[PDB]
């Protein structure tokens, strides 16, 4: 499971400051994999937080506690 290359390409191009900027095919594949890691880490960390506070599920409160360090790690 994971992100499609075309999706990731469009997301990145949304944000480039210069219309000249392009992304290599190999770089695009690495970005597909890196976004997967990011999302899975968010989920897994959220689950760890929920486990730690004996919550019934990962809700936003749990997620929020893990976000600062997640972003530092990416």
């Amino acid at each position: 499971s994971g992100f499609r290359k075309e999706l990731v390409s469009r997301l990145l191009h949304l944000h480039f400051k210069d219309d000249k900027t392009k992304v290599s095919g190999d770089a695009l594949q690495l970005m597909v994999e890196l976004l997967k890691v990011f999302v899975v880490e968010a989920a897994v960390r959220g689950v760890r937080q929920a486990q730690a506070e004996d919550a019934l599920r990962v809700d936003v409160d749990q997620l929020e506690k893990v976000l600062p360090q997640l972003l530092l790690d990416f």
């Binding site: 997301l11 949304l14 900027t21 190999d26 770089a27 890196l34 936003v60 976000l67 790690d73």
Partner: protein, 93 residues
């Protein structure tokens, strides 16, 4: 609209990834949590893209390459071991 569709595509993929984690870890995610992770991921793409572009220009390239992405993935040394091990297999073609 254009960005709505992109966010929906992200939200679908994020849902699928979270489902896999939920199934594996035996712990449910709220619908709100899944949406927040999708939004986080959409916003994180803004930062990845700007950094990548600057890293390329730093090396005087207008086309982003694998070195730019690996520089991006430096953050954690465990994040680093993945990006360097996942640049080889794709580069096994």
């Amino acid at each position: 609209s254009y960005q709505q569709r992109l966010k929906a595509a992200v939200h679908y993929t994020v849902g699928c990834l979270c489902e896999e984690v939920a199934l594996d870890k035996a712990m449910q995610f709220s619908k709100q949590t899944i949406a927040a992770i999708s939004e986080l991921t959409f916003r994180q793409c803004e930062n990845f893209a700007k950094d990548l572009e600057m890293f390329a220009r730093h090396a005087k390239r207008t086309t982003i390459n694998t070195e730019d992405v690996k520089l991006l993935a430096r953050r954690s040394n465990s994040l680093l071991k993945y990006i360097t091990d996942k640049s080889e297999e794709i580069a096994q073609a």
